[PDB]
Amino acid sequence: SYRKLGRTSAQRKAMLRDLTTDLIINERIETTETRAKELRSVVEKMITLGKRGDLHARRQAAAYIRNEVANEENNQDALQKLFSDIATRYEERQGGYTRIMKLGPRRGDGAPMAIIELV
Amino acid sequence: MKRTFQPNNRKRSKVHGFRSRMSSKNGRLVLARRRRKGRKVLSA
């Protein structure tokens, strides 16, 4: 199933479209736990479009990646970073692009933080 | 909704203020019981 995450069906899209972009810039995020486990199901679809590289394939991926400059001084968008960097690295790999490592809970709410890293 | 101390600098000081209670002889008994008791805030 999917996860409701306490957000409205439009709030989840703005939720997930941010976090998938932030894996492109940061290479790793410390979300909460079910914000981690529910993020890997989208990015491993989104990196799958990276390996294609069609003019049709990029225009599917722009609906989950926003307009944010990723590397300074090269002026790359996060859309550009998938097809230039990430796809050139995962031509060996078939699935399982982002491993998830659990960290301990958080102080102010007891929420289980979790670390996502791509791999 | 609306409550009863709609605050006024003027209307508070004219109805209840000092010279209004040095005005009438019954009004000065208010300034006698405010003195034999010995309050600090004489008439508001």
Partner: protein, 109 residues
């Protein structure tokens, strides 16, 4: 045997009996590790008292501090603050800001 006393740090007692009942009987190598990970955020109030109780037994008596058995761990409701919290329809109920007294008597095996 050693003793540390907390004396009036604001937490409820019943929110600190529960942190306490994974300590009474344990060891120093078996409680400082456990209190860091409960998470139960009245823990580092107590963990700054147990670790201060050990460094009482470090300096003041030198009781071979890594070999200690935690013996007494009672917590009593200290001087209670009391505040009025307002409420609708003119009720104005009360909020009892509790306070506790943590005592962790640390002793030799």
């Amino acid at each position: 045997q050693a003793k540390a006393v907390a004396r009036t740090v604001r937490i409820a007692p019943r929110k600190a009996r529960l942190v306490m009942d994974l300590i009474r009987g344990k060891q120093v190598g078996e409680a400082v590790s456990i209190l860091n990970l409960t998470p139960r955020a009245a823990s580092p109030i107590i963990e700054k008292v147990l670790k201060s109780a050990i460094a009482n037994a470090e300096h003041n008596y030198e009781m071979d501090a890594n070999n200690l058995v935690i013996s007494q761990a009672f917590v009593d409701e200290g001087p209670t603050l009391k505040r009025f919290r307002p409420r609708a329809m003119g009720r104005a109920s009360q909020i009892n800001k509790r306070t506790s007294h943590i005592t962790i008597v640390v002793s030799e095996k």
